[PDB]
Amino acid sequence: PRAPRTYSKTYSTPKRPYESSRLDAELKLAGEFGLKNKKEIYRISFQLSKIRRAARDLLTRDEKDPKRLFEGNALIRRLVRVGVLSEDKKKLDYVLALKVEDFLERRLQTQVYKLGLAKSVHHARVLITQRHIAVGKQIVNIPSFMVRLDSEKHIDFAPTSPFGGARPGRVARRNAARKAEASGE
Amino acid sequence: GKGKPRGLNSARKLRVHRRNNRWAENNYKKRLLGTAFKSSPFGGSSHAKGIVLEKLGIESKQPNSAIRKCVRVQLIKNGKKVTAFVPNDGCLNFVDENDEVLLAGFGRKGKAKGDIPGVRFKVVKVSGVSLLALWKEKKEKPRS
Amino acid sequence: MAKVHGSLARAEKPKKPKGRAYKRLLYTRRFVNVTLVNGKRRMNPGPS
Amino acid sequence: ARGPKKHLKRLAAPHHWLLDKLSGCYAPRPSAGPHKLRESLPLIVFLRNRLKYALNGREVKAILMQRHVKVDGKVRTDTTYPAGFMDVITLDATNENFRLVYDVKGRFAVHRITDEEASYKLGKVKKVQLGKKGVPYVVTHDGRTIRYPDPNIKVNDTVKIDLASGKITDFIKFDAGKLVYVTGGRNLGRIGTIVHKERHDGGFDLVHIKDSLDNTFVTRLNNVFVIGEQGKPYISLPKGKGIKLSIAEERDRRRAQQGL
RNA sequence: GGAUAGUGGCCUACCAUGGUUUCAACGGGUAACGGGGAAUAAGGGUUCGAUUCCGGAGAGGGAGCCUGAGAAACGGCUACCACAUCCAAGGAAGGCAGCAGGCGCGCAAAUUACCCAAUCCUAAUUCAGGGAGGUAGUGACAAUAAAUAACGAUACAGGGCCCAUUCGGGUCUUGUAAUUGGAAUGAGUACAAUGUAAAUACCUUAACGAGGAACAAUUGGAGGGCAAGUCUGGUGCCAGCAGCCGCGGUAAUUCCAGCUCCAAUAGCGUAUAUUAAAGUUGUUGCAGUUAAAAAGCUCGUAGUUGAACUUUGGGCCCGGUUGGCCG
RNA sequence: GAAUUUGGACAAACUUGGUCAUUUAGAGGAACUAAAAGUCGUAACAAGGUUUCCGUAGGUGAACCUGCGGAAGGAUCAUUA
Ligand SMILES: [Mg+2]
Ligand SMILES: [Mg+2]
Ligand SMILES: [Mg+2]
Ligand SMILES: [Mg+2]
Ligand SMILES: [Mg+2]
Ligand SMILES: [Mg+2]
Ligand SMILES: [Mg+2]
Ligand SMILES: [Mg+2]
Ligand SMILES: [Mg+2]
Ligand SMILES: [Mg+2]
Ligand SMILES: [Mg+2]
Ligand SMILES: [Mg+2]
Ligand SMILES: [Mg+2]
Ligand SMILES: [Mg+2]
Ligand SMILES: [Mg+2]
Ligand SMILES: [Mg+2]
Ligand SMILES: [Mg+2]
Ligand SMILES: [Mg+2]
Ligand SMILES: [Mg+2]
Ligand SMILES: [Mg+2]
Ligand SMILES: [Mg+2]
Ligand SMILES: [Mg+2]
Ligand SMILES: [Mg+2]
Ligand SMILES: [Mg+2]
Ligand SMILES: [Mg+2]
Ligand SMILES: [Mg+2]
Ligand SMILES: [Mg+2]
């Protein structure tokens, strides 16, 4: 006797397991963006899919019907806040045409490398999970943050971080102590 | 007219016909006759402990002669004798007699022209140790 | 086989990187540094 | 089971209390009283969930035990007292007066009330009848029995009641073209004028109602509750005035009250 | 009429001779509690639902009853049946399908822990009580998130980009080298504080905390299906060999061991069940000359199915909701 | 107003046979198996049958013939009108 804590899966494993084409596509996709599981890809494929379903289910209904209007506009403006859907494509028929990379391109991981705070994408990984990289007043340490558009123009280093400001890290002051003590001697 | 009633007030004939016709499916018949609870040696469970009755040197000829190092095991819950494969083991230094053995399913179809039969079970555990771990020299076997 | 009691954590050839890193390795094992052998993409060859 | 139940599980509580579903495992089963279980609000809910005046349950008992909280002029000290529709609630230490009337969205709403409106109360007349020694009386929805009413008052009529003496000030008849709050059902929380009453014998009467935006709907007579006259209500309606808007309209109205 | 809080064959007398049934009664089965719901499918479906909410039923099996508004109550009583305990042998007590815990059973499931602080309930009642409930322990049931490394220089090594007339002018990307260099960080440890009924932890944070030749990642595979060996030795007395089909023996990509590589990765294999695949259950949607399958043939009741036709056509007016050309 | 007693409805349970249905421990007997071993029978012996079927009847025998009625699921040349 509680309420039963609801919960759900997030991804979905491919239907054909060994398919030299899908295999590769996936690998290059992990490569552009430095993902670690294929699972990271699947998660995207899956959200995408739920959106394509909502999309169609709206599409089959009459234009100027309250529901298609309401949920349509919502789905649209939601897709826009994260800048997955461009400003000009603001009509359902494009949200179908959406593909995976359009989602993979809004990760904090990605935007860190495309706002040039990192040297390579992998660098951006490390830098994120290292508690270095803030979005405004918040630190964020998940590579999958999914940057909204109005939060693009705030991403910087953490006021906590060595690069952001503050004091040097543990290694730095370790070597500072080593050289200072070795010279005092 | 494709030989089935197609009328709007015809449901009963349709669904009844379907029920009488589902008895040609195999699994359906197994599932409503409780064949699993009445006959199947496992009693409708994914596994069964048994005690090795006798070490069997069956010989299954065509097209490939298996010097079948298999076992007669008797399941504890049914007192029901069964034959079972003991995989990956060349010498059978792992499985002796009077040994408790956890069995699972195993899908070897038997063949006709060489009188090779289909055992349906593989040893998964002996004396509480996993056949695999023994075979990997990962875990050792308590011998009693 | 037998790792002795000293599994108490608190108080050979090069290794392969794990996780993300490993994938990176593969991405360059197959696409940045392509190895075209005999008109095909050969994976795991000995002497040829 | 065997006797009356004394608990109420969390999920099984009437939804419009808006109890969160991880706070506990139970929910304040309303005591026996003036209103139906399903459609009443236990004071603890009104006090801790809707006024935020107390954080726990015992804080609420603490409050109630200083004779602070009045309901219909009188002091109740039962955490699970069932104050339902149109009841007056008094918090003297804050000098506030509340009325339990339905929000547009079918739930109970906080509503501040002047001292001059707190004095009285409306009551749907659920049944008039003749009692002992031939004395005629009404029984009004909050359970109140009133003696010697005016003979013009039959069923479904509303009655104004001085909370002080418990006597009948005046009343209102159930005729076409009156103002009406709809209490039970889906359209619960709406307000409008009664177009015409549909009469089905041995069954449930319906009522067609047309609101101030000249839109129409239908409910059983069971949920129709008379307020007053065309734009001349006897009680003060909340904001919203019992006018229900499509989700589009509400989306727009909300996004149009944002200019910082 | 009796009984019941009350209708009522509920029961009792007395009358009738009815009531159900191929639109499947009655009986038998269910390894059946019912529903809200769950899994899976484009759809249509198929299959689950002991289990967090609702309703019902039971407290070892039967039956009976006190008290009371409410019980045919079992953390009430009485008896019989099954078990079983203490005895000084006279007697006396017993129901964990409440929480923990034990035995047994099995393929199969945790602590004889802390507390009324939340949630709510009971009482004469703000205070008392609550294994209801909450908190921690165990636990790879599951579900979410996501560390196991990021750089640089160097050289060797190469390719490419423009000046090649040749040195060199630099951009870039790589292969390396158990090469170097200095950055980073939480796994872990720990003052404090926060948290908390009290703690544990999380989140915070002094202080420590890796070149990581080991803060060392696995589980399955590499003939085909099916992603991956044109690699060495051994075999070939423990040897063509075990989901299915393949394939040989001095020289084997097909077996065994190592090396390599592939797939999914804090997880992966295997067994049973079930859904898809399965248009191999077919209403949507199968097939029936020869592959499985048109009754030997007609008649015929239930059942399913059933030709056409009975105010069309014209005239008037009213006011709505999208769309244009103007704003 | 207790022990006790009359008769009821409710009705657990007991005894008895009879009956199916099982769990059993025993005994009676029969039949099947070979990673058992050797022995003869024909292995280590030689061929022959080959339109094929259907229903039915009989005969048997170690098998297979055979009567009656069906079927092609059996290989249309030649001449001519
Ligand atoms: Mg109960
Ligand atoms: Mg209703
Ligand atoms: Mg059952
Ligand atoms: Mg389908
Ligand atoms: Mg259920
Ligand atoms: Mg059960
Ligand atoms: Mg229940
Ligand atoms: Mg009961
Ligand atoms: Mg029991
Ligand atoms: Mg009582
Ligand atoms: Mg009882
Ligand atoms: Mg008990
Ligand atoms: Mg009880
Ligand atoms: Mg228990
Ligand atoms: Mg208490
Ligand atoms: Mg509990
Ligand atoms: Mg788990
Ligand atoms: Mg403290
Ligand atoms: Mg391996
Ligand atoms: Mg293979
Ligand atoms: Mg394969
Ligand atoms: Mg291949
Ligand atoms: Mg077919
Ligand atoms: Mg045939
Ligand atoms: Mg045929
Ligand atoms: Mg025929
Ligand atoms: Mg017709």
Side-chain angles (χ1 to χ4, degrees), chain A residues 71-128:
Chain A
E71 302 185 349
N73 287 354
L75 169 58
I76 270 165
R77 80 116 219 184
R78 205 221 316 312
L79 277 194
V80 135
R81 269 178 85 195
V82 261
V84 192
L85 199 65
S86 69
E87 196 72 18
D88 39 89
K89 301 299 183 188
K90 281 186 163 190
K91 269 171 186 180
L92 279 163
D93 297 311
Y94 296 108
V95 333
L96 284 154
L98 238 46
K99 31 178 193 161
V100 172
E101 306 184 348
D102 283 323
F103 277 104
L104 235 40
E105 196 69 9
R106 302 297 307 168
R107 314 187 81 224
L108 213 274
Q109 154 111 140
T110 290
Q111 298 283 316
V112 150
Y113 175 82
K114 301 294 200 163
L115 274 179
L117 315 185
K119 291 197 172 188
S120 166
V121 182
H122 305 249
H123 188 60
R125 256 294 178 153
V126 155
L127 289 199
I128 277 155

Coordinates of all heavy atoms in Angstrom, one line a residue, chain A residues 71-128:
Chain A
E71 N -2.9 20.3 -29.6 CA -1.7 19.4 -29.4 C -0.7 19.6 -30.5 O 0.5 19.4 -30.3 CB -2.2 18.0 -29.4 CG -3.2 17.6 -28.3 CD -3.5 16.1 -28.2 OE1 -3.1 15.4 -29.1 OE2 -4.1 15.7 -27.2
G72 N -1.2 20.0 -31.7 CA -0.3 20.3 -32.8 C 0.6 21.4 -32.4 O 1.8 21.3 -32.4
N73 N 0.0 22.6 -32.1 CA 0.8 23.8 -31.7 C 1.7 23.5 -30.6 O 2.8 24.0 -30.6 CB -0.2 24.9 -31.4 CG -0.8 25.5 -32.6 OD1 -0.5 25.1 -33.7 ND2 -1.7 26.4 -32.4
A74 N 1.2 22.8 -29.6 CA 2.1 22.4 -28.4 C 3.3 21.6 -28.9 O 4.4 22.0 -28.5 CB 1.3 21.6 -27.4
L75 N 3.1 20.5 -29.6 CA 4.2 19.7 -30.0 C 5.2 20.5 -30.8 O 6.4 20.3 -30.7 CB 3.6 18.5 -30.9 CG 4.6 17.7 -31.7 CD1 5.6 17.1 -30.7 CD2 3.9 16.6 -32.4
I76 N 4.7 21.4 -31.6 CA 5.5 22.3 -32.5 C 6.4 23.2 -31.6 O 7.6 23.2 -31.8 CB 4.6 23.0 -33.4 CG1 4.4 22.2 -34.7 CG2 5.1 24.4 -33.7 CD1 3.3 22.7 -35.6
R77 N 5.7 23.9 -30.7 CA 6.4 25.0 -30.0 C 7.4 24.3 -29.0 O 8.4 24.9 -28.6 CB 5.5 25.9 -29.3 CG 4.9 25.4 -28.0 CD 5.3 26.2 -26.8 NE 5.6 25.4 -25.6 CZ 6.0 25.9 -24.4 NH1 6.0 27.2 -24.2 NH2 6.3 25.1 -23.4
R78 N 7.1 23.1 -28.6 CA 8.0 22.3 -27.7 C 9.2 21.9 -28.5 O 10.3 22.0 -28.0 CB 7.3 21.0 -27.3 CG 7.8 20.5 -26.0 CD 7.9 18.9 -26.0 NE 6.7 18.2 -26.5 CZ 5.5 18.4 -26.2 NH1 5.1 19.4 -25.3 NH2 4.5 17.7 -26.7
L79 N 9.0 21.4 -29.7 CA 10.1 21.1 -30.6 C 11.0 22.2 -30.9 O 12.2 22.1 -31.2 CB 9.6 20.4 -31.9 CG 9.3 18.9 -31.8 CD1 9.2 18.4 -33.2 CD2 10.4 18.2 -31.0
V80 N 10.4 23.4 -30.9 CA 11.1 24.7 -31.3 C 11.9 25.2 -30.1 O 13.1 25.7 -30.3 CB 10.1 25.8 -31.7 CG1 10.4 27.1 -31.1 CG2 10.1 25.8 -33.2
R81 N 11.4 25.2 -28.9 CA 12.2 25.6 -27.7 C 13.5 25.0 -27.6 O 14.4 25.6 -27.0 CB 11.4 25.4 -26.4 CG 10.5 26.5 -26.0 CD 9.7 26.1 -24.7 NE 10.5 26.4 -23.5 CZ 10.2 25.9 -22.3 NH1 9.2 25.1 -22.2 NH2 10.9 26.2 -21.2
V82 N 13.7 23.7 -28.0 CA 14.9 23.0 -27.9 C 15.7 23.2 -29.3 O 16.8 22.7 -29.4 CB 14.7 21.6 -27.6 CG1 15.0 21.3 -26.2 CG2 13.3 21.1 -28.0
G83 N 15.1 23.9 -30.2 CA 15.7 24.2 -31.5 C 16.0 22.9 -32.2 O 17.1 22.8 -32.8
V84 N 15.1 22.0 -32.2 CA 15.2 20.8 -33.0 C 14.6 21.1 -34.4 O 15.0 20.7 -35.4 CB 14.5 19.6 -32.4 CG1 15.0 18.3 -33.1 CG2 14.9 19.5 -30.9
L85 N 13.5 21.8 -34.3 CA 12.7 22.2 -35.4 C 13.0 23.7 -35.7 O 13.0 24.5 -34.7 CB 11.2 22.1 -35.1 CG 10.3 22.0 -36.4 CD1 10.7 20.8 -37.2 CD2 8.9 22.0 -35.9
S86 N 13.3 24.1 -36.9 CA 13.7 25.4 -37.2 C 12.5 26.4 -37.2 O 11.4 26.0 -37.2 CB 14.5 25.5 -38.5 OG 13.6 25.3 -39.6
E87 N 12.8 27.7 -37.1 CA 11.8 28.7 -37.0 C 10.8 28.7 -38.2 O 9.6 29.1 -38.0 CB 12.4 30.1 -36.9 CG 11.5 31.2 -36.4 CD 11.2 31.0 -34.9 OE1 11.9 30.3 -34.2 OE2 10.2 31.6 -34.5
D88 N 11.3 28.4 -39.3 CA 10.6 28.5 -40.6 C 9.7 27.2 -40.9 O 8.8 27.3 -41.7 CB 11.5 28.8 -41.7 CG 12.8 28.0 -41.6 OD1 12.9 26.8 -42.1 OD2 13.8 28.5 -41.0
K89 N 10.1 26.1 -40.3 CA 9.4 24.8 -40.5 C 8.2 24.6 -39.6 O 7.8 23.5 -39.4 CB 10.4 23.7 -40.4 CG 11.6 23.8 -41.4 CD 11.1 23.8 -42.8 CE 12.3 23.8 -43.8 NZ 11.8 24.0 -45.2
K90 N 7.7 25.7 -39.0 CA 6.7 25.6 -37.9 C 5.3 25.0 -38.4 O 4.3 25.5 -38.1 CB 6.4 27.0 -37.4 CG 7.4 27.5 -36.4 CD 6.8 28.8 -35.8 CE 7.5 29.2 -34.5 NZ 6.8 30.3 -33.9
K91 N 5.4 23.8 -39.1 CA 4.1 23.1 -39.4 C 4.4 21.6 -39.4 O 5.4 21.1 -39.9 CB 3.6 23.6 -40.7 CG 2.6 24.7 -40.5 CD 2.1 25.3 -41.8 CE 1.3 26.5 -41.6 NZ 0.8 27.2 -42.8
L92 N 3.4 20.9 -38.9 CA 3.5 19.5 -38.5 C 4.3 18.6 -39.5 O 5.1 17.8 -39.2 CB 2.1 18.9 -38.4 CG 1.5 19.1 -37.0 CD1 0.0 18.8 -37.2 CD2 2.1 18.2 -36.0
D93 N 4.1 18.9 -40.8 CA 4.6 18.1 -41.9 C 6.1 18.0 -41.9 O 6.7 17.2 -42.6 CB 4.0 18.6 -43.2 CG 2.5 18.5 -43.3 OD1 2.0 17.4 -43.0 OD2 1.9 19.5 -43.6
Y94 N 6.7 18.9 -41.2 CA 8.2 18.9 -41.1 C 8.7 18.1 -40.0 O 9.8 17.5 -40.0 CB 8.7 20.3 -41.1 CG 8.4 21.2 -42.3 CD1 7.5 22.2 -42.2 CD2 9.1 20.9 -43.5 CE1 7.3 23.0 -43.3 CE2 8.8 21.7 -44.6 CZ 7.9 22.7 -44.5 OH 7.6 23.5 -45.6
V95 N 7.9 18.0 -38.9 CA 8.3 17.4 -37.7 C 8.3 15.9 -37.9 O 8.9 15.1 -37.2 CB 7.3 17.7 -36.5 CG1 6.7 19.1 -36.7 CG2 6.3 16.7 -36.4
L96 N 7.6 15.4 -39.0 CA 7.7 14.1 -39.4 C 9.1 13.9 -40.1 O 9.8 12.8 -39.9 CB 6.6 13.7 -40.4 CG 5.3 13.5 -39.7 CD1 4.1 13.8 -40.6 CD2 5.2 12.1 -39.1
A97 N 9.5 14.8 -40.9 CA 10.7 14.7 -41.7 C 12.0 14.8 -40.9 O 13.0 14.5 -41.3 CB 10.7 15.9 -42.8
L98 N 11.8 15.3 -39.6 CA 12.9 15.3 -38.6 C 13.7 14.0 -38.6 O 13.1 12.9 -38.7 CB 12.3 15.5 -37.3 CG 12.7 16.7 -36.5 CD1 12.8 17.9 -37.4 CD2 11.8 16.9 -35.3
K99 N 15.0 14.1 -38.4 CA 15.7 12.9 -38.2 C 16.5 12.9 -36.9 O 16.4 13.9 -36.2 CB 16.6 12.6 -39.4 CG 17.1 13.8 -40.2 CD 18.0 13.3 -41.3 CE 18.8 14.4 -41.9 NZ 20.0 13.9 -42.6
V100 N 17.3 11.9 -36.7 CA 18.0 11.6 -35.5 C 19.0 12.7 -35.2 O 19.0 13.3 -34.1 CB 18.7 10.3 -35.5 CG1 19.5 10.1 -34.3 CG2 17.6 9.2 -35.5
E101 N 19.8 13.0 -36.1 CA 20.9 14.0 -35.9 C 20.4 15.4 -35.4 O 21.0 16.1 -34.7 CB 21.7 14.2 -37.2 CG 22.2 12.9 -37.7 CD 23.1 13.0 -39.0 OE1 23.1 14.1 -39.5 OE2 23.8 12.0 -39.4
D102 N 19.2 15.7 -35.9 CA 18.5 17.0 -35.5 C 18.3 17.0 -34.0 O 18.2 18.1 -33.4 CB 17.1 17.1 -36.1 CG 17.2 17.6 -37.6 OD1 18.1 18.4 -37.9 OD2 16.4 17.1 -38.4
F103 N 18.3 15.8 -33.3 CA 18.1 15.7 -31.9 C 19.5 15.6 -31.3 O 19.8 16.2 -30.3 CB 17.3 14.5 -31.5 CG 15.9 14.7 -31.5 CD1 15.1 14.2 -32.5 CD2 15.3 15.5 -30.5 CE1 13.7 14.4 -32.6 CE2 13.9 15.7 -30.6 CZ 13.2 15.2 -31.6
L104 N 20.4 14.9 -31.9 CA 21.7 14.6 -31.4 C 22.5 15.9 -31.4 O 23.6 16.0 -30.7 CB 22.4 13.6 -32.2 CG 23.0 12.4 -31.5 CD1 22.0 12.0 -30.4 CD2 23.2 11.3 -32.4
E105 N 22.0 17.0 -32.1 CA 22.8 18.2 -32.2 C 22.5 19.2 -31.1 O 23.1 20.3 -31.1 CB 22.5 18.8 -33.6 CG 23.5 19.9 -34.1 CD 24.9 19.4 -34.4 OE1 25.1 18.1 -34.4 OE2 25.9 20.2 -34.6
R106 N 21.6 18.9 -30.2 CA 21.3 19.8 -29.2 C 21.8 19.4 -27.8 O 21.5 20.1 -26.8 CB 19.7 20.1 -29.1 CG 19.1 20.6 -30.4 CD 19.7 22.0 -30.8 NE 19.6 22.9 -29.7 CZ 20.2 24.1 -29.7 NH1 20.9 24.5 -30.8 NH2 20.0 25.0 -28.7
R107 N 22.5 18.3 -27.8 CA 23.1 17.9 -26.5 C 24.1 18.9 -25.9 O 24.7 19.6 -26.6 CB 23.8 16.5 -26.7 CG 23.1 15.5 -27.5 CD 23.8 14.2 -27.5 NE 23.6 13.4 -26.2 CZ 24.5 12.8 -25.5 NH1 25.8 12.8 -25.9 NH2 24.2 12.1 -24.4
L108 N 24.2 18.9 -24.6 CA 25.1 19.8 -23.9 C 26.5 19.5 -24.4 O 27.3 20.3 -24.7 CB 25.0 19.7 -22.4 CG 25.3 20.9 -21.5 CD1 26.7 21.1 -21.2 CD2 24.7 22.2 -22.2
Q109 N 26.7 18.2 -24.4 CA 27.9 17.6 -25.0 C 28.3 18.3 -26.3 O 29.4 18.7 -26.5 CB 27.7 16.1 -25.3 CG 28.4 15.5 -26.4 CD 29.4 14.5 -25.9 OE1 29.7 13.4 -26.4 NE2 30.1 14.8 -24.8
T110 N 27.4 18.3 -27.2 CA 27.6 18.9 -28.6 C 27.8 20.4 -28.5 O 28.8 20.9 -29.0 CB 26.4 18.5 -29.5 OG1 26.4 17.1 -29.7 CG2 26.5 19.3 -30.8
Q111 N 26.9 21.1 -27.9 CA 26.9 22.5 -27.9 C 28.1 23.1 -27.1 O 28.5 24.2 -27.3 CB 25.6 23.1 -27.2 CG 24.4 22.7 -27.9 CD 24.2 23.6 -29.1 OE1 24.4 24.8 -29.0 NE2 23.8 23.0 -30.2
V112 N 28.7 22.2 -26.3 CA 30.0 22.7 -25.7 C 31.1 22.7 -26.7 O 31.9 23.6 -26.7 CB 30.3 21.8 -24.5 CG1 31.8 21.7 -24.2 CG2 29.7 22.3 -23.2
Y113 N 31.1 21.8 -27.6 CA 32.1 21.7 -28.6 C 31.8 22.7 -29.8 O 32.7 23.1 -30.5 CB 32.2 20.3 -29.2 CG 33.1 20.2 -30.4 CD1 34.5 20.1 -30.2 CD2 32.6 20.2 -31.7 CE1 35.4 20.0 -31.3 CE2 33.5 20.1 -32.8 CZ 34.9 20.0 -32.6 OH 35.7 19.9 -33.6
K114 N 30.5 23.1 -29.9 CA 30.2 24.1 -31.0 C 30.1 25.5 -30.4 O 29.7 26.4 -31.2 CB 28.8 23.6 -31.6 CG 28.8 22.3 -32.2 CD 29.7 22.2 -33.4 CE 29.4 21.0 -34.3 NZ 30.0 21.2 -35.7
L115 N 30.3 25.7 -29.2 CA 30.5 27.0 -28.6 C 32.0 27.2 -28.2 O 32.4 28.1 -27.6 CB 29.6 27.3 -27.4 CG 28.2 27.8 -27.8 CD1 27.3 28.0 -26.6 CD2 28.3 29.0 -28.7
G116 N 32.7 26.2 -28.7 CA 34.2 26.2 -28.6 C 34.8 26.3 -27.2 O 35.7 27.1 -27.0
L117 N 34.2 25.6 -26.3 CA 34.8 25.6 -24.9 C 35.6 24.4 -24.8 O 36.3 24.2 -23.8 CB 33.7 25.7 -23.9 CG 32.7 26.8 -24.2 CD1 31.7 26.9 -23.0 CD2 33.3 28.1 -24.5
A118 N 35.5 23.5 -25.8 CA 36.2 22.2 -25.8 C 37.0 22.1 -27.1 O 36.7 22.7 -28.1 CB 35.3 21.1 -25.6
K119 N 38.0 21.3 -27.1 CA 38.9 21.1 -28.3 C 38.3 20.0 -29.2 O 38.3 20.2 -30.4 CB 40.3 20.7 -27.9 CG 41.1 21.8 -27.2 CD 42.5 21.5 -27.2 CE 43.3 22.8 -26.7 NZ 44.8 22.6 -26.8
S120 N 37.9 18.9 -28.7 CA 37.2 17.8 -29.4 C 35.9 17.5 -28.7 O 35.7 18.0 -27.6 CB 38.1 16.6 -29.6 OG 37.3 15.5 -30.0
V121 N 35.1 16.6 -29.2 CA 33.8 16.3 -28.6 C 34.0 15.5 -27.3 O 33.4 15.8 -26.3 CB 32.9 15.5 -29.5 CG1 31.6 15.3 -28.8 CG2 32.6 16.3 -30.8
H122 N 35.0 14.6 -27.4 CA 35.3 13.8 -26.3 C 35.7 14.7 -25.1 O 35.4 14.5 -23.9 CB 36.4 12.8 -26.6 CG 36.0 11.9 -27.8 ND1 35.7 10.6 -27.7 CD2 35.8 12.2 -29.1 CE1 35.4 10.1 -28.9 NE2 35.5 11.0 -29.8
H123 N 36.5 15.7 -25.5 CA 36.9 16.7 -24.5 C 35.6 17.3 -23.8 O 35.6 17.4 -22.6 CB 37.7 17.8 -25.1 CG 38.3 18.7 -24.1 ND1 39.2 18.3 -23.1 CD2 38.2 20.1 -23.9 CE1 39.6 19.3 -22.4 NE2 39.0 20.4 -22.8
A124 N 34.6 17.5 -24.6 CA 33.4 18.1 -24.1 C 32.7 17.1 -23.1 O 32.2 17.6 -22.0 CB 32.4 18.4 -25.2
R125 N 32.6 15.8 -23.4 CA 32.2 14.8 -22.4 C 32.9 15.1 -21.1 O 32.3 15.6 -20.1 CB 32.6 13.4 -22.9 CG 31.6 12.5 -23.4 CD 30.5 12.2 -22.4 NE 29.6 11.4 -23.1 CZ 28.8 10.4 -22.6 NH1 28.9 10.2 -21.3 NH2 27.9 9.7 -23.4
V126 N 34.2 14.8 -21.1 CA 35.0 14.9 -19.9 C 34.7 16.2 -19.2 O 34.4 16.1 -18.0 CB 36.4 14.7 -20.2 CG1 37.3 15.4 -19.2 CG2 36.8 13.3 -20.4
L127 N 34.8 17.3 -19.9 CA 34.5 18.6 -19.3 C 33.1 18.7 -18.6 O 33.0 19.4 -17.7 CB 34.7 19.7 -20.3 CG 36.1 19.9 -20.8 CD1 36.1 21.3 -21.4 CD2 37.1 19.8 -19.6
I128 N 32.2 18.0 -19.2 CA 30.8 18.1 -18.6 C 30.8 17.3 -17.3 O 30.5 17.9 -16.2 CB 29.7 17.6 -19.5 CG1 29.4 18.7 -20.5 CG2 28.5 17.2 -18.8 CD1 28.8 18.2 -21.8

